[PDB]
Amino acid sequence: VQIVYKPVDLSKVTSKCGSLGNIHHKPGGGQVEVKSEKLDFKDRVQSKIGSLDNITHVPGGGNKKIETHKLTF
Amino acid sequence: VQIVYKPVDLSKVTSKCGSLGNIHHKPGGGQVEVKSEKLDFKDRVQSKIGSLDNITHVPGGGNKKIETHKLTF
Amino acid sequence: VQIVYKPVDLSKVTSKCGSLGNIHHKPGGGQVEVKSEKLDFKDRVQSKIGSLDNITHVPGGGNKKIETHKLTF
Amino acid sequence: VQIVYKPVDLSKVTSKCGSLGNIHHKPGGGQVEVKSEKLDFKDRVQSKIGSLDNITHVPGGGNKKIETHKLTF
Amino acid sequence: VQIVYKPVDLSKVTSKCGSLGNIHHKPGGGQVEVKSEKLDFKDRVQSKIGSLDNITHVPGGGNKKIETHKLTF
Amino acid sequence: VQIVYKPVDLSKVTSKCGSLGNIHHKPGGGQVEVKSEKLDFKDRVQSKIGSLDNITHVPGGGNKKIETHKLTF
Amino acid sequence: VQIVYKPVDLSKVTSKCGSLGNIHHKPGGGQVEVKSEKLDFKDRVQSKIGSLDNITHVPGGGNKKIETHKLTF
Amino acid sequence: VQIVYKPVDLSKVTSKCGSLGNIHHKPGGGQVEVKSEKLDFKDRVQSKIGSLDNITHVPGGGNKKIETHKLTF
Amino acid sequence: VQIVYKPVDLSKVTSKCGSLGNIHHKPGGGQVEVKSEKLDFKDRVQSKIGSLDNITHVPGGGNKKIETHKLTF
Amino acid sequence: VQIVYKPVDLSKVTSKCGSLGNIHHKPGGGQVEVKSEKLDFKDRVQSKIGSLDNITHVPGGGNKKIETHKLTF
């Protein structure tokens, strides 16, 4: 068996921006209550229990490229 | 058996912007109550239990390219 | 068996920005209460229990490239 | 069996920015209460229990490249 | 069996910035209370229990490159 | 002229209570914005401009008696 | 002219209470913004401009009696 | 002219209480911003400009009696 | 002219309390910003400009009696 | 003219308390910023400009009596 894998990639993900400007993120805080008894978990688990988060994310370009290659014989 | 895999890609994902400008994110906070007894979970699990989140996301281009290649013999 | 793997990649992820500018992140704090009894967990687990986080993220370009290559014989 | 692995990569992740500017992160503090009884955990576990964190992250470019190569015979 | 692994990489992750500027991080302190009884953990565990942290991170470029190569015969 | 003023008062304002009990006042905070230019005021003026107040008032009897007597000749 | 003023008062304002009990006042903080230019005021003026106040008032009886007597000849 | 002023007062303002109990006042802090240019005031003026106050007032009886007598000839 | 002023007062303001108990005042701190240019004031003026105060007041009876007598001929 | 002023007062302001108990005052500190240019004031003026005060006041009875007598001929 002969396998040739050559996925040539010539590419760009780009952006141009003059300015981003005035960004105002001003939340009132609220209130979060979470009640549970038993938390049992495993094997690739991501969790958030009870939160009040504020995220301001202002990159000067946040261009993203995700690529995967899988060859299984 | 002979397999030739050559998916050539010449491409672009792009943007241009003069300015983003005045962005105002101003939430009142509310109230979140969550009640449970037993949380049992596993094997690739993502969860959020009880939240009050505020996200302001203003990238100067957030162009995205996702690509996957799978060859199974 | 003969396998040739040569995924040539010529690429760019880029951005240009004049200025980012005035960014104001001013949250009121709220209140978070979390109650549980037993936390039992294992094997690749990420968790946040009870939080009030504030993140301001302003990179002068936060361009990202993620790439994976897997060859299983 | 003959395997040749030569994933040549010619690439760039870049950014240019005139200035970042005036960034103001001014949170009110809130209040976080977390109650539990038994914490039992193991094998690649990351956790945050009870927090009030404030992060200001302003890199002059925070361009990121992540790449992995895996060959399993 | 013959295996040749030569993933040649010619690349750059870069940034240019005129100035970063005026960055003001001024949080009010809040209050964090965490109550538990038994903490039992092992085998690659990272944890934070009860915190009020403030991080100001302003690198003059915080460009990052992460790369891994794994060959298993 | 003869004026006799003798408004005799025999009275009670009273209360009895076993217990008041469990009182929970838990507001989410909201947001108040007030804009004006010129505030000009005088002669017995009470005012509140822009507020977010929370009052919990639980007296163990808050019985009130208000009485006024005015004789003008 | 003869004026006789004898407003005899025999009275009580009272209360009895076994217990007041569990009182929980737990507000999330919000956000208040007030903008003005000129504040000009006089002659018995009470004012609050811009506030976020939290008052918990739990007297073990807060019985009140207010009485005024005015004789003008 | 003959004026006789004898407002006899026999009275009580009272309270009895077994216990006051568990009082919890736990506010999240918010944020208050006040902007003005000129403050000009006089003649019996009380004011609060810009505040975030928290008052817990728990007297073991806060019974109050206010009385005024005015005779103007 | 003959004026007789004899406002006899036989009275009590009282309270009894077994115990006051567990009082917890635990605020998160917030943030207060006040901006002005000229403060001009006089003649019986009380003011607070910019504050974040926390008062816990727990008297074992805070009974109050205020009385005024004014005779103007 | 004959004026007789004899406002006889037989009275008490009192309290009894078994115990006051466990009082916990635990504030997070916040942040106060006050900006002005010219402060000009006179003639019976009380002021606080910019403060973060914490007062715990727990008298074993703080009963108060205020009385004034004014005779103007």
Author numbering:
A (entry chain H), B (entry chain J), C (entry chain F), D (entry chain D), E (entry chain B), F (entry chain I), ...: 306 to 378
What does the article say, verbatim?
Adult individuals with Down syndrome (DS) develop Alzheimer disease (AD). Tau filaments (paired helical filaments and straight filaments) were identical to those in AD, supporting the notion of a common mechanism through which amyloids trigger aggregation of tau.
Western blot analysis of the sarkosyl-insoluble fractions from the gray matter of cases 1 and 2 using the anti-tau antibody HT7 shows the presence of tau bands with a migration pattern corresponding to 3+4R tau, with identical electrophoretic mobility in both cases. We showed that there is no variation in the structure of tau filaments between individuals with DS and sAD (and FAD), and tau in other brain amyloidosis, further supporting the notion of a common mechanism through which different amyloids trigger aggregation of tau, resulting in tau filaments with identical structure at their core.
